[PDB]
Design a protein around this ligand. Structure first.
Ligand code: MG
Ligand code: MG
Ligand code: MG
Ligand code: MG
Ligand code: MG
Ligand code: MG
Ligand code: MG
Ligand code: MG
Ligand code: MG
Ligand code: MG
Ligand code: MG
Ligand code: MG
Ligand code: MG
Ligand code: MG
Ligand code: MG
Ligand code: MG
Ligand code: MG
Ligand code: MG
Ligand code: MG
Lengths: 33, 141, 218, 180, 83
RNA sequence: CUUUAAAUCCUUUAACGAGGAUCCAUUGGAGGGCAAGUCUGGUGCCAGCAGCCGCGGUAAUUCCAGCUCCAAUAGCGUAUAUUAAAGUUGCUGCAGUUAAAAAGCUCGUAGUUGGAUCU
């Protein structure tokens, strides 16, 4: 099952309260670390 | 520009010595007015007697009532507003008690929403607030 | 399938150019991304350095775009950097990867003391500038490692430098300028005239001039 | 005034950045591969290697004919060859900079007991050493961080008093035999 | 360039400008590698041999490539001495 | 037994001494800086947290708890003085048009500095 999309989360919450989280998630999706 | 002569050591040293006084922290540490005005007198901690309990309104945009205590130090007799940091710890302090007070963490500068408060309570009635909060020790009574 | 649109691409596809150093020797601009894939191939690894949202004020409200910084390298003497701004994150990342592998430069490596074995550090002190950011690279003894901030360290590792001392001045919180300054400093290694390069240059046939008859056919 | 000595020093240095992912991964890999108790044991060997590298780099700035360089680099190389990290053919002063922490980690008694087949695991080797089952050519050693010299490599065995090296059976065997 | 053993250790050897001796980098797109044909002294036709000059972009931006090429050709005997 | 003035401790040795081997490892955190959960239950700009940015006004990734997860480890938090970070005291090595800044202008003692030339 495909539950969470980091790209959508960042693009939607980049200016919200949960920005610092989603950015931190997006890097994990990109750099593999 | 600066002088680069071979015999200009006195000029350079004198200029640096005189221009060090325009540094805020060097002047604060070497002038003596701050040490005289410091209620602790340079100590890390102090002991005082709780004069009363007060509530300080948190600065905007935050809205809350920070519980504090007015105390009077034993060595010099100065009056100080100290913060009691925890959920419900103000019920561990009674009036006319003896408390240990330390700094707030910013070297005499106010921290957070609390205006003009730079001290916090550590131990009350010779027992630590952490032990009372975690229920490890009881009030002596 | 790859169909080149330039003479250099046709020469590379038809196996007329042996190595990328032939292209670097004649300072021929690279306009096709497939050449680097043909030469460097699997040794290339990339890493996203930053995703930065920028906004343009309009009548109805702000319009947001995302800028991706991607550094790439093969850890064996070549390094590149790319920046791409788009509406979507994935498109910007793909564009940044393409732009980074397009602008790939070689790195010259030297010795600190006795010249034994393979080179491990920069030939000399090199400085790069970008905005207010100044970055200085200094040779280091073998086994020292890279003494720098996290951002320049990744580019130095991807370039293939093992040991180096680093100095930096200016507002380095600007990640783009911080990366571009050290990229420029790394690029300046082959542009420094050292006494061991004082020999007179022997010229050679340019790939355009050498393979003109084959280019006429295709 | 007293007749005591106050000379002492620390054997490790803490890293500047407390939370660095790459450093944590590398240190945990080292701990897992060599069965170390904590991060401090890695930092101790790192400090030792740093001191050796600093001395070697300081001796490399002198002239080749300087008497102090010739006297002290020779001693440093001799000690490195003695402990086994260096080789006889690589006794130049530049090769010291080519040393890594794994070379020093390979010379501990804990890893040498495991590599010689006395133990079936590195953790088992540490347990055997700490429980007084291993002797070094005459002496029972129970310090895992013991650094084995080259000439002592052939002389690691079970202690004569150990149940494994021909000694009396242990507590559990005696109790179980008493049971039946 | 090379180690103590004498083995050459470099990716490539960059070429230098013929006018100013400066190194022509890999990203210098204003540099020129020009060839000048050689003629037979008897007939005047194309010999098949040529002389190669390389000019960096810094000189070209200064507008000094014309004089440099002229002097290089005069030194090689392509241009008449009584130019 | 040895140790010592006589002892103690360490070392050496008889006998007893581990399955929940209950012979139980703690101190701080889990938004970013900075390693690690927008999991569940409460509270509802209150209580509180927060070095800084900030969180909390009925779906709180930040408060009070449970579970789980991080870091160091017989050690770990807090307050204060001090060093590096600070090329934010700059001799190495900082700035002075507009971000803080060159005296309204000139003369001038001390100080600093001072053109070639001799085998
Ligand atoms: Mg002030
Ligand atoms: Mg608020
Ligand atoms: Mg800043
Ligand atoms: Mg805990
Ligand atoms: Mg919690
Ligand atoms: Mg944090
Ligand atoms: Mg993190
Ligand atoms: Mg604020
Ligand atoms: Mg709720
Ligand atoms: Mg909740
Ligand atoms: Mg300081
Ligand atoms: Mg410094
Ligand atoms: Mg300051
Ligand atoms: Mg300097
Ligand atoms: Mg400044
Ligand atoms: Mg002004
Ligand atoms: Mg004026
Ligand atoms: Mg005068
Ligand atoms: Mg003179």
């Amino acid at each position: 099952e495909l539950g969470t999309d980091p790209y959508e989360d960042f693009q939607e919450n980049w200016n919200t309260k949960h920005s610092s989280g989603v950015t931190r998630e997006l890097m994990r999706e990109l750099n593999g670390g | 520009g600066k002088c680069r002569g071979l015999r200009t050591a006195r000029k350079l040293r004198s200029h640096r010595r005189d221009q060090k006084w325009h540094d805020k922290q060097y002047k604060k540490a070497h002038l003596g007015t701050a040490l005289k005005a410091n209620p602790f007198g340079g100590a890390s901690h102090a002991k005082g007697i709780v004069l009363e309990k007060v509530g300080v309104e948190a600065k905007q945009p935050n809205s809350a009532i920070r519980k504090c205590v007015r105390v009077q130090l034993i060595k010099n007799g100065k009056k100080i507003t100290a913060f009691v940091p925890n959920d419900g710890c103000l019920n561990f302090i009674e009036e006319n008690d003896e408390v240990l007070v330390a700094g707030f963490g910013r070297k005499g500068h106010a921290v957070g929403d609390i205006p003009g408060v730079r001290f916090k309570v550590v131990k009350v009635a010779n027992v630590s607030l952490l032990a009372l909060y975690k229920g490890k020790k009881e009030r002596p009574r | 399938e790859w169909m080149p649109v330039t003479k250099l691409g046709r020469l590379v596809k038809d196996m007329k150019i042996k190595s990328l150093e032939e292209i670097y020797l004649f300072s021929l601009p690279i306009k096709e991304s497939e050449i680097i894939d043909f030469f460097l191939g699997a040794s290339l690894k990339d890493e996203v350095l930053k995703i930065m949202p920028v906004q343009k004020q309009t009548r109805a409200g702000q319009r947001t775009r995302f800028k991706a910084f991607v550094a790439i390298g093969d850890y064996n003497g070549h390094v590149g950097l790319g920046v791409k701004c788009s509406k979507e994150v994935a498109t910007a990342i793909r564009g940044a990867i393409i732009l980074a592998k397009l602008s790939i430069v070689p790195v010259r490596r030297g010795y600190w003391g006795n010249k034994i074995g393979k080179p491990h550090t920069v030939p000399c002190k090199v400085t790069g500038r970008c905005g207010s950011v100044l970055v200085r690279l200094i040779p280091a003894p073998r086994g020292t490692g890279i003494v720098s901030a996290p951002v320049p360290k990744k580019l130095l590792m991807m370039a293939g430098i093992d040991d180096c001392y680093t100095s930096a001045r200016g507002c380095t919180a600007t990640l783009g300028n911080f990366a571009k300054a050290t990229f420029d400093a790394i690029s300046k290694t082959y542009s420094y005239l050292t006494p061991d390069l004082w020999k007179e240059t022997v010229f050679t046939k340019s790939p355009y001039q050498e393979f003109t008859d084959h280019l006429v056919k295709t | 005034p007293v007749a005591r000595s106050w000379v002492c020093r620390k054997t490790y240095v803490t890293p500047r950045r407390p939370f660095e992912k790459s450093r944590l991964d590398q240190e945990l890999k080292l701990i897992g591969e060599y069965g170390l108790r904590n991060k401090r044991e890695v930092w101790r060997v790192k400090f030792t290697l740093a001191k050796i590298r600093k001395a070697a780099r300081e001796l490399l700035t002198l002239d080749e004919k300087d008497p102090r360089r010739l006297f002290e680099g020779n001693a440093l190389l001799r000690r490195l060859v003695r402990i086994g990290v260096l080789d006889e053919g690589k006794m130049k002063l530049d090769y010291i900079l080519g040393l890594k922490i794994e070379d020093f980690l390979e010379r501990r008694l804990q890893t040498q007991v495991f590599k010689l087949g006395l133990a079936k695991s590195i953790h088992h080797a540490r347990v055997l050493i700490r429980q007084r089952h291993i002797r070094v050519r005459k002496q029972v050693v129970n310090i895992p961080s013991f650094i084995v010299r080259l000439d002592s490599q052939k002389h690691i065995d079970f202690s004569l008093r150990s149940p494994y090296g021909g000694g009396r059976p242990g507590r559990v065997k005696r109790k179980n035999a008493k049971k039946g | 360039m090379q180690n103590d053993a004498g083995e050459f250790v470099d990716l490539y050897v960059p070429r230098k400008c013929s006018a100013s001796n400066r190194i022509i980098g890999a990203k210098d797109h204003a540099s020129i590698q020009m060839n000048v044909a050689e003629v037979d002294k008897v007939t005047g036709r194309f010999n098949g041999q040529f002389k190669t000059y390389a000019i960096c972009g810094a000189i070209r931006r200064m507008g000094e490539s014309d004089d440099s090429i002229l002097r290089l050709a005069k030194a090689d005997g392509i241009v008449s001495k009584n130019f």
